[PDB]
Design a protein around this ligand. Structure first.
Ligand SMILES: CCCCCCCCCCCCCCCCCC(=O)OC[C@H](CO[C@@H]1O[C@H](CO[C@H]2O[C@H](CO)[C@H](O)[C@H](O)[C@H]2O)[C@H](O)[C@H](O)[C@H]1O)OC(=O)CCCCCCCCCCCCCCCCC
Ligand SMILES: CCCCCCCCCCCCCCCC(=O)OC[C@H](CO[C@@H]1O[C@H](CS(=O)(=O)O)[C@@H](O)[C@H](O)[C@H]1O)OC(=O)CCCCCCCCCCCCCCC
Ligand SMILES: CCCCCCCCCCCCCCCC(=O)OC[C@H](COP(=O)(O)OC[C@@H](O)CO)OC(=O)CCCCCCCCCCCCCCC
Ligand code: SF4
Ligand code: SF4
Ligand code: SF4
Lengths: 158, 149, 145, 393, 68, 111, 204, 189, 60
């Protein structure tokens, strides 16, 4: 469609999509995971030096898991940096993303959070552990199809 | 304070999980027995004390030097760390201020020609307030006060 | 400091229902509850504003209807009548049951009159409703109010 | 007494029972002689699952939930939780509601920096003004209790149309009294640390995050401003009529604990200026004067206008978060508290991600404990301004 | 078949080797297998079931349920 | 590292108690039914809880020795203890110091 | 059974302290444990800040007698001032078990009474602290204001003044000790303390 | 070279003067009047918006469920049976568990008949948790008035002290909140 | 039957109180203490008074 980073920075053998725009004007990009570490790297050599909100969601209870990356061009002053968002759609039967920790280190703990909540295994970043659940927990609690067990503490007050 | 005494009489024992059960109960006793024993030295008036004790304040310093043995006893006899570390820390603190205390008492023992506290006060109760040792030891009083704190 | 004997149990056996006037800083009236429990009574310390319609909660069955947090249904729980279930599930040679209400304030005069008449009617049941306030622990019978 | 004495590096637990106001996190540090070699922070002892609760809550019934992440400046959390369906549906807020929001958020920033400042001075060794900081925090508590109903957290004050209720009849006067009381206190708090050489010896070079290393680690707020970056989201994003005032973002060039202290003290001094400049330019002034002007001048004459209201079309509880996604943010007391909302024309969100201001500042804590001593741990953890309800959420 | 408001129960053999079983444990709790889980939302081939346990709701497939 | 599942009315404590110390053993795990005495525990229902616990720890063979599985065993034993209390085989204590009914109020059967 | 969760008949237990000397010594015992009441400096969530608002100067914590303690061994009371998760619950039962026997618990806030706003859709919140600990006084309010907390302390003092000194024996634990052999596989310690020295931070 | 000996004594005497100054100014803290709101005899008044215990009026209730659908945890147990003799909703046994309640008063705002009001009552501590299940007659009780207890000197906190006052301890005789009210500018201008 | 009835409008006249010049709606009458409901604000408050400090209005 359009996009001031797709038509501007993504014509250097990277082959990305364009999901449209957000409701805050943020341009979205759909990226196949196999060239994520390429497409983020050219975005780090462009000026997007600040990774905020490495989120992840479900996009349907049986559909593909998504791992989002909200980049921004953090300069020294005001007035609205370009602020792009990347999306990586991974299959649920094998959720696996190359980690962006060696580009932005902010995803040291945000990838741990998205792995703890969804099971998206991040390849490359050092600690892939449960960061919020107990470290011996079984299951991924923020999926739509998470059957939470009937622990006695989780039951009603009686 | 009295309730804070009495409640601590009513509470049970704990014995932390492999504690020595002899050194554990003795640590507080070893650290508070010589402090109580050092109350022979203090007068509330001329012959209003337990004993004159010709080596008075030197015996007080010698008895106060037994405190970093009950400290190390209470540090060791618990099976956890951070109290062994705390015990070594308190014993290293408690021996770093014995010697300035001894030197500040040594200046008063110079000026008093003795170590008994009756003779120490009697060399100040001659002119009331001008013969007090704080005017003649202005920095010795500070050394003793900071080392005793 | 006010070595209290066992006169409190005698005023309880006399009046049947006495209003306590406790200092509001804490536990200076529980010595009387322990004196009362040492004479053979069974005290049932519970908070009065949590009870509603004491004719129904004390001696009647009442549906509790606990909280469904958007998950269960209404699920009415029929709690047994508190005074008679705690009186029948008691030793037969005990001195009786005592309802120790710790908030006599924020209750009406009608509930006070009902509590006094309830202690008068069925034989072994006494209430020590704590209407609070006074500078020392002092108690009156629940006669006028 | 089975504690032996090895020559290998030990391990200090610093577990979830913290005997001070430090939250619930483990801080398993090694520290061979004194140098902290490694640091594994264990997180999640307050993980109650707000992101999964949010997908089953309407926004009108998730506003009581959002005080519990940053539970020292609670309304900041409402300041994103309200602003996330506000910018999907395009619901405009009145000017008076926006100024009331600015006043509440800057009072929350003052209270958040006060609750940081108490434990920070207690950890650095001052420990005298710990009991004097809670007094002004109780002043802010009693200011919040008049307007919002509750104290520091459980406010239902922010709504999609603005603010749930306008101010009380004596609120502007007492808030001006609190600011006239509180202007010398921040100078006293600055002179407590900077005019004492033992404290600045304890705080110089302790945690040496760079300017570019702060951008790479995703630091925000006073941890980013102390490294050198003039990045305030109230200025970068033209947010909620914050540009109608004249305040300067405080920055420092070092990046250590003293720089973070200076940035937070000057943030208090700038937020009270924003409070004064918003109380002056409040549309209609105080609520007693505005209610009197809309009482005596009929039912007309611009005091019944839209931008002089406290609520912009008070909405039904069955308000549908419309289909679409974006990412709102505020600059809270720790900076960049963000919400990623992917609502899909349901009464509930489909995904409500919480980007916490100090979950991304606590990952730099092993990097900041590299060449430091033992007793400089709680200073560095003090300088992050960590609140574990936001870190875990 | 299954609509909004029907008390459904989860068929375990239909659930045991699906991609819905990847999200949770393979040791399913017994509140699934009693006829008390209420369907609250259907968004095409999947239903949101609210069980009377005070824990979050599950999005399961429509052929993994049956009306009790 | 001692593996355990400590809630009310059950304590799992993977290991064996020696004197007042529980030493962490791999291939055993203890059980401490009601360590605070909210319930009465006659020997018939106590043997029932013991048999249910041995059945639960036999059915949990082959899994990990994590605290998650110990918490699962303890929670299933908690549901069994509450089922015995709800059936009427177990009463509340009424000699305790708290009396807060952590497994439901007394209530009549039907109405 | 006709009563679903029944209470049980006691064994007719009575002390029958007709002595007035030991009754006054019991009064001294209850007043002494009543007017000291040293709580554990225990936090974990929102409510702790209101608990800290008691320790400050506007509401005074000390004027009922209670100074906060760092170690649970010196702690007489525990005010569970916040949400108990599935991760925090064994730590909380451990730091309650490490206290001397005349100990008291106050379930502060809705998160420890019933797990108040997390009692609906949370997967990692213990619905009530009385699923773990015997609780003396329950304290409502989501952030209960400090007057409500030192009202819960007043009701705790009313609870303490009732306790008999001959009735010590309710402070027991009453072991049952059923040991079973199991066939589960031991896993290595996943969380060791190696964060930056782990050989995965250095290079991809 | 005595440049580090005199600097040593200078640092020592500067620390000594700092300790003496801080000891003089911590001795000026004892003369100040204590700000302690002494709770059981000085219960501080809550504000006009407090959100304490919820009050319920059993006759002003149309037996809808708006107070459940706006509560964050769907807490109030309202159950009704439809009486076709009258064809209204006919509530019976409304109740709210106050051990689960988070006291946000969402149910108070979204009440179409102004049935649910909120009170100034916060001293809700109980020994038994299940006593916090206030049914329709329990929570239909008149709340505890702090200014009508003859053991309490009630204290206005900060937002009800007139125009220069910071603490409500030195208040002479019931001085009002800040100043004028909207029935004054209508008479002024 | 002539005394203060529930359902009307009131206004407080107790001068040394936090609630002064406040118009309210009387809601419940037990034992003389009158509990009035205040519509002022987003949350409806119920504040208890007595008949010695209340007087009904004639205008509304
Ligand atoms: C703690 C519990 C307290 C004990 C229960 C209450 C006892 C109260 C009775 C007080 C007795 C008066 C004490 C006294 O005159 O002590 C006298 C005796 C004997 O002392 C003699 O005193 C003579 C004079 O000496 C004094 O004078 C000399 C110079 O001539 C010295 O310079 C120096 O000042 C001093 O030694 C002798 O020299 C000898 O010292 C000695 O023989 O001591 C003694 O038995 C001391 C016995 C113990 C006394 C402990 C209480 C005293 C402290 C509180 C006093 C307050 C009373 C006044 C209150 C004000 C009310 C308006
Ligand atoms: C002397 C030891 C005699 C035994 C004491 C029995 C316990 C007293 C009590 O409960 O109140 C406690 C009272 C204080 O309040 C006091 O309480 C008294 C009782 S009252 O409110 O009617 O409680 C009151 O009369 C009195 O004015 C008030 O000071 O006295 C005490 O503190 C007794 C302990 C002091 C010494 C013990 C060692
Ligand atoms: C007679 C004594 C003479 C000894 C002089 C030694 C000087 C030699 C240099 C000594 C020297 O260089 O090494 C001592 C050393 C300080 O010097 P540094 O080596 O650390 O300095 C770093 C170097 O690179 C610069 O020289 O250790 C200390 O910290 C103690 C001295 C400072 C302590 C400051 C506080 C002490 C005074 C506070 C008093 C408080 C009590 C009053 C309360 C009421
Ligand atoms: S009850 Fe409310 S304030 Fe207290 S911990 Fe829970 S959420 Fe936080
Ligand atoms: S919203 Fe009001 S009228 Fe409707 S059921 Fe609830 S209390 Fe009754
Ligand atoms: S106050 Fe809030 S939590 Fe309590 S019942 Fe009303 S809506 Fe629910």
């Amino acid at each position: 469609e359009a996009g001031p980073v797709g038509r501007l920075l993504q014509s250097q053998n990277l082959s990305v999509e364009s999901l449209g725009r957000d409701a805050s004007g943020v341009e979205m990009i759909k990226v196949d995971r196999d060239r994520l570490l390429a497409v983020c790297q050219t975005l780090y050599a462009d000026g997007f030096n600040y990774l905020r909100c490495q989120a992840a969601y479900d996009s349907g209870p049986g559909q593909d898991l998504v791992s989002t990356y909200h980049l921004i061009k953090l300069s020294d002053n005001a007035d609205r940096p370009p602020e792009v968002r990347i999306k990586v759609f991974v299959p649920r039967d094998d959720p696996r993303v190359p980690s962006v920790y060696w580009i932005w280190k902010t995803a040291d703990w945000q990838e741990r959070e998205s792995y703890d909540m969804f099971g998206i295994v991040y390849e490359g970043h050092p600690n892939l552990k449960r960061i919020l659940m107990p470290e011996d927990w079984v299951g991924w609690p923020l999926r739509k199809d998470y059957i939470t067990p009937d622990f006695y503490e989780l039951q009603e007050a009686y | 304070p009295l309730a804070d005494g009495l409640k601590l009489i009513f509470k049970e024992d704990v014995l932390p999980a492999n504690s020595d059960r002899w050194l554990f109960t003795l640590g507080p006793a070893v650290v508070v027995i010589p402090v109580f024993l050092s109350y022979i030295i203090v007068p509330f008036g001329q012959n209003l004390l337990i004993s004159n004790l010709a080596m008075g304040v030197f015996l007080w310093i010698a008895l106060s030097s037994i405190a970093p043995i009950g400290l190390l006893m209470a540090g060791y006899a618990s099976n956890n760390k951070y109290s062994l570390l705390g015990g070594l820390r308190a014993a290293a603190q408690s021996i770093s201020y014995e010697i300035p205390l001894a030197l500040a008492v040594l200046a008063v023992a110079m000026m008093s020609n003795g170590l008994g506290t009756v003779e120490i006060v009697e060399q100040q109760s001659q002119y009331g307030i001008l013969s007090w040792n704080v005017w003649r030891q202005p920095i010795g009083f500070l050394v003793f006060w900071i080392a005793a704190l | 400091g006010l070595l209290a004997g066992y006169q409190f149990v005698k005023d309880l056996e006399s009046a049947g229902a006495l209003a306590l006037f406790v200092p509001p800083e804490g536990g200076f009236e529980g010595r009387y509850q322990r004196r009362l429990r040492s004479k053979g009574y069974t005290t049932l310390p519970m908070s009065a504003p949590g009870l509603g319609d004491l004719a129904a909660y004390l001696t009647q069955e009442h549906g509790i209807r606990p909280a469904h947090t958007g998950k269960e249904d209404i699920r009415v729980y029929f709690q047994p009548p508190l005074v008679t279930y705690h009186l029948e599930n008691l030793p037969p040679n005990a001195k009786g049951l005592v309802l120790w209400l710790i908030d006599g304030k924020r209750l009406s005069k009608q509930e006070f009159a009902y509590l006094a008449q309830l202690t008068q009617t069925l034989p072994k049941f006494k209430v020590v409703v704590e209407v609070g306030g006074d500078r020392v622990v002092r108690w009156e019978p629940l006669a006028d109010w | 007494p089975k504690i032996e004495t090895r020559t290998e590096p030990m391990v200090i637990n610093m577990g979830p029972h913290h005997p001070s106001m430090h939250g619930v996190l483990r801080l398993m540090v090694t520290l061979d002689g004194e140098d902290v070699i490694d640091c594994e922070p264990v997180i999640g002892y307050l993980h109650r699952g707000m992101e999964k609760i949010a997908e089953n809550r309407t926004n009108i019934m998730f506003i009581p939930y959002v005080s519990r992440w940053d539970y020292a400046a609670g309304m900041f959390n409402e300041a994103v939780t309200v602003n996330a369906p506000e910018k999907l549906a395009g619901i405009p807020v009145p000017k008076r509601a926006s100024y009331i929001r600015v006043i509440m958020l800057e009072l929350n920033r003052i209270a958040n920096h006060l609750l940081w400042l108490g434990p920070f001075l207690a950890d650095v060794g001052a420990q005298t003004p710990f009991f004097y900081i809670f007094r002004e925090r109780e002043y802010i508590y009693d200011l919040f209790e008049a307007a919002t109903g509750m104290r520091f957290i459980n406010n239902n004050y922010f709504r999609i149309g603005g603010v749930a209720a306008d101010l009380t009849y004596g609120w502007v006067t007492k808030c001006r009294d609190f600011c006239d009381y509180f202007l010398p206190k921040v100078d006293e708090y600055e002179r407590l640390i900077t005019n004492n050489p033992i404290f600045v010896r304890r705080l110089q070079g302790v945690g040496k995050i760079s300017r570019e290393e702060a951008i790479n680690w995703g630091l925000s707020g006073p941890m980013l401003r102390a490294s050198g970056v003039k990045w305030d989201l109230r200025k970068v994003d033209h947010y909620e009529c914050y540009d109608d005032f004249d305040w300067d973002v405080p920055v420092a060039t070092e990046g250590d604990c003293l720089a973070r202290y200076i940035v937070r003290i000057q943030e208090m001094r700038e937020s009270v200026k924003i409070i004064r400049q918003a109380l002056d330019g409040l549309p209609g002034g105080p609520y007693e004067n505005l209610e009197a002007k809309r009482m005596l001048e009929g039912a007309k004459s611009e005091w019944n206008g839209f931008d002089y209201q406290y609520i912009g079309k008070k909405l039904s509880p069955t308000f549908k978060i419309p289909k679409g996604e974006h990412y709102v943010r505020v600059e809270s007391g720790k900076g960049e508290l963000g919400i990623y909302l992917i609502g899909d024309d349901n009464v509930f969100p489909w995904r409500w991600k919480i980007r916490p201001p100090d979950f991304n500042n606590l990952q730099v804590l092993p990097q900041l404990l590299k060449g430091m001593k033992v007793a400089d741990i709680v200073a560095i953890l003090g300088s992050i301004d960590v609140i574990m309800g936001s870190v875990d959420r | 078949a299954i609509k909004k408001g029907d008390l459904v129960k989860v068929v375990a053999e239909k659930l045991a080797n699906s991609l819905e079983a990847l999200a949770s444990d393979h040791r399913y709790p017994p509140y699934l297998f009693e006829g008390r889980g209420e369907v609250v939302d259907i968004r095409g081939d999947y239903a949101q079931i609210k069980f009377p346990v005070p824990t979050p709701t599950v999005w399961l497939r429509l052929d993994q349920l049956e009306v009790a | 590292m001692l593996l355990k599942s400590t809630t009310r009315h059950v304590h799992i404590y993977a290991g064996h108690v020696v004197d007042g110390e529980v030493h962490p053993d791999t291939e055993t795990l203890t059980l401490n039914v009601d360590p605070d005495n909210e319930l009465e525990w006659n020997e018939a229902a106590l043997a029932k809880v013991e048999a249910k616990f041995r059945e639960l720890v036999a059915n949990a063979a082959g899994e990990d020795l994590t605290e998650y599985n110990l918490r699962r065993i303890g929670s299933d034993l908690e549901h069994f203890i509450r089922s015995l209390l709800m059936q009427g085989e177990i009463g509340y204590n009424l000699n305790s110091r708290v009396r807060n009914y952590s497994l439901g109020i007394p209530r009549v059967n039907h109405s | 059974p006709a009563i679903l969760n029944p209470i049980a008949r006691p064994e007719v237990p009575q002390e029958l302290a007709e002595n007035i000397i030991l009754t006054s010594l019991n009064d001294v015992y209850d007043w002494a444990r009543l007017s000291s009441l040293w709580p554990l400096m225990y936090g974990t969530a929102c409510c702790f800040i209101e608990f800290a608002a008691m320790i400050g100067s506007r509401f005074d914590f000390d004027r009922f007698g209670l100074v906060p303690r760092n170690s649970p061994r010196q702690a007489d009371l525990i005010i569970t001032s916040g949400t108990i998760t599935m991760k925090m619950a064994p730590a909380l039962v451990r730091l309650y078990e490490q206290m001397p026997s005349p100990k008291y618990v106050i379930a502060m806030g809705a998160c420890t009474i019933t797990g108040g706003m997390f009692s609906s859709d949370s997967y990692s919140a213990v619905r009530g602290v009385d699923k773990l600990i015997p609780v003396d006084v329950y304290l409502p309010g989501c952030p209960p204001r400090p007057e409500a907390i030192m009202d819960a302390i007043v009701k705790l003092r009313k609870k303490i003044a009732n306790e008999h000194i001959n009735e010590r024996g309710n402070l027991a634990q009453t072991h049952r000790l059923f040991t079973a052999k199991h066939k589960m596989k031991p896993v290595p310690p996943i969380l060791t303390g190696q964060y930056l020295n782990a050989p995965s931070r250095q290079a991809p | 070279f005595l440049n580090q000996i005199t600097n040593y004594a200078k640092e020592a005497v500067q620390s000594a003067k700092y300790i003496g100054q801080g000891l003089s100014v911590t001795f000026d803290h004892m003369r100040r009047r204590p700000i302690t709101v002494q709770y059981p005899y000085e219960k501080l008044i809550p504000s006009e918006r407090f959100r304490g215990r919820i009050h319920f009026e059993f006759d002003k209730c149309i037996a809808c469920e708006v107070c459940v659908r706006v509560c964050p945890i769907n807490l109030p147990v309202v159950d009704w049976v439809f009486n076709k003799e009258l064809k209204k909703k006919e509530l019976k046994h409304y109740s709210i568990d106050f051990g689960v309640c988070i006291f946000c008063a969402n149910c108070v705002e979204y009440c179409p008949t102004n049935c649910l009001s909120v009170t100034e009552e916060y001293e809700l501590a109980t020994y038994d948790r299940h006593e916090l299940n206030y049914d329709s007659v329990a929570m239909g009780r008149i709340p505890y008035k702090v200014t009508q207890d003859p053991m309490v000197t009630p204290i206005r906190e900060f937002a009800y002290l007139p125009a220069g006052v910071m603490s409500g301890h030195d208040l002479p005789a019931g001085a009002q909140r800040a100043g004028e009210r909207p029935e004054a500018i209508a008479n002024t201008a | 039957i002539m005394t203060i009835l529930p359902g009307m409008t009131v206004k407080v006249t107790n001068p040394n109180d936090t609630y002064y010049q406040f118009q309210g709606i009387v809601q419940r009458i037990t034992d003389g203490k009158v509990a009035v409901l205040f519509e002022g604000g987003n949350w409806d408050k119920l504040v208890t008074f007595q008949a010695s400090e209340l007087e009904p209005v004639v205008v509304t």
